[PDB]
Ligand binder design. Structure first.
Ligand SMILES: *[C@](O)(C(=O)NC)[C@H](C[C@@H]1CCNC1=O)NC(=O)[C@H](CC1CC1)n1cccc(NC(=O)OC(C)(C)C)c1=O
Ligand SMILES: *[C@](O)(C(=O)NC)[C@H](C[C@H]1CCNC1=O)NC(=O)[C@H](CC1CC1)n1cccc(NC(=O)OC(C)(C)C)c1=O
Ligand SMILES: [Cl-]
Lengths: 306, 306
């Protein structure tokens, strides 16, 4: 048993990670086939970044200006291209280690693994959810940009995130791999802010189910709520309204534990109202909301990858 | 910006995960050069494991009684030895993906990443800590055995743990890669109890520095303490004694923050006494003790691996 925050195994993503340098700026690219995907702000300097004309600065750039590096190997760049906020560097060699892959745009509430890299080199990996306000709570230092977020369904790598900026509050913003920002954010020096976050209710119930599967059940009660009456409470505390689709999505864990959603919902209403009364759940002193239904099923039924 | 429980990238260990089957029992093997290491309870039937004679059981097995699979490819076993609680299977092929590596035996309070495997397939990666009672709070289902713990020091993978058993309350025990157990446990299906866990004081302090490095300051007080005065209070909240070497080891972080260790101790001493009274630190409502001084430097100064 046990229950941890669990990243995907990162090896298939390490294989793709390169260093990209334009003038003074060095960060990370994602090397799939003969293309290297990196944030388009690799091109500009500390100046302009007030409000930089990427179309215009790219025209001036020479392929020679991009020093791309895979360990102890300079890759010849032979073409450059811009999609939204991502630079595409055509190079004269396809990546021997390209895995099967997809570019997907995840919905808020959905979780991925992040491989934090510096100078094309991976530092560490960690799990994190796309907040409803389209920020993520990462761990990103200068040089981290171009680091990516991904899910691994079997042998297929689904790339969902490339890193761009930090925000005030120590939260992060970035793009899908077609270079569109999650949320209303922009690749400038321009001053920017998250907007009010909400608690991902569906995920809190999932984790409660996770605790029950793992013996931690002190908070189970003989009481029941309607969906409506449950939302009337949780919504007061800035929790996502819970929907029938949410309740359906919780079907499998409801069945595995034998506890109905609207029963667990009465445990959740109580924990919000009276707090945890000095107790922990899965060794947490608050209600963790960064595990999806599927994340619990994965960890707790033990589904493997390759 | 941000701080996070961060696992080492698992790429280099993934290429060493094999499946080992002996009759009706399947678990994970660690394949380094021409040797596969697994737990020795792979030669047992579910009735042998109540009180087995592993020496006797191993005498009654041939090389062919070990089906070792690396992807599709089966590996021919050409020898077998038992070192303490691990099986060493000599195979006919050297692992091309074998990293530079060594075997270490870690101290309590030291952290490492776990690559949870089922059937020689890597499933998940998570950081944890050798608890002072010689257990690990991991995430392990049936089939997980042979999954290892490890650090990366630049490019050298240090293997520190192989997984063997679950103990009461959903904590875990295993061995170093010489098959010696951490703590007083045995390779047996017997009633075994872990012993009372305490909090890793030097780690909580390391994390209080992380809080302060990431702009969490509220818990700083205008007081200092003696080591002795600190231990008197910590003893009474099940905190491991803080020694002069723990203070000395905390020096670099003290110097980075300008906050004297024994002043940080005095802030911790107040937190144990008055509790946290509903406030968080790095988004935790309890004091984290699973980051080493070196982990905090690692992540805050962003050190990288290859
Ligand atoms: C990225 O460009 C990089 O790694 N380049 C080498 C960095 C990564 C961030 C800096 C440290 N933490 C990070 O996550 N991003 C930026 O520097 C980013 C580039 C903009 C085009 C998007 N960026 C520029 C300017 C200002 C900020 N934000 C900022 O200063 O935020 C506060 C919280 C005020 C410090 C920013 O992210
Ligand atoms: C491991 O052997 C395996 O994966 N084999 C295929 C397995 C690890 C799993 C099982 C559930 N959680 C885990 O960590 N270990 C065992 O099953 C071990 C075998 C060890 C040689 C003795 N094992 C066997 C019997 C009983 C127990 N523990 C047990 O009964 O746990 C409680 C009830 C909590 C005391 C055990 O770990
Ligand atoms: Cl907590």
């Amino acid at each position: 048993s046990g229950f941890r925050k669990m990243a995907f195994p990162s090896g298939k993503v390490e294989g793709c990670m390169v260093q990209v340098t334009c003038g003074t700026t060095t960060l990370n690219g994602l090397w799939l086939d003969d293309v290297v995907y990196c944030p388009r702000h690799v091109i500009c300097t500390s100046e302009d970044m007030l409000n930089p004309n990427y179309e215009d600065l790219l025209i001036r750039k020479s392929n020679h200006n991009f020093l791309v590096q895979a360990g102890n190997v300079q890759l010849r760049v032979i073409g450059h291209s811009m999609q939204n906020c991502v630079l595409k560097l055509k190079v004269d060699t396809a990546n021997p280690k390209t895995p099967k892959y997809k570019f997907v745009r995840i919905q808020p509430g959905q979780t991925f693994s992040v491989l934090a890299c510096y100078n094309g080199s991976p530092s560490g990996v960690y799990q994190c959810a796309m907040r409803p306000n389209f920020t993520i709570k990462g761990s990103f230092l200068n040089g981290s940009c171009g680091s990516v977020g991904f899910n691994i369904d079997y042998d297929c790598v689904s790339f969902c995130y490339m890193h761009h900026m930090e925000l005030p509050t120590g939260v992060h913003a970035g793009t899908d791999l077609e270079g569109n920002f999650y949320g209303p954010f922009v690749d400038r020096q321009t001053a920017q802010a998250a907007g009010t976050d909400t608690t991902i209710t569906v995920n809190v119930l999932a984790w409660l189910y996770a605790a029950v599967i793992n013996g931690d059940r002190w908070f189970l009660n003989r009481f029941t709520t309607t969906l409506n009456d449950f939302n009337l409470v949780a919504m007061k505390y800035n929790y996502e309204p819970l929907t029938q689709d949410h309740v359906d999505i919780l079907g499998p864990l409801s069945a595995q534990t034998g506890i109905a959603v609207l029963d667990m919902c009465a445990s959740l209403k109580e924990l919000l109202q009276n707090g945890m009364n000095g107790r922990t759940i899965l060794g947490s002193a608050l209600l963790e909301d960064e595990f999806t239904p599927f994340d619990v099923v994965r960890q707790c039924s033990g589904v493997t990858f390759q």
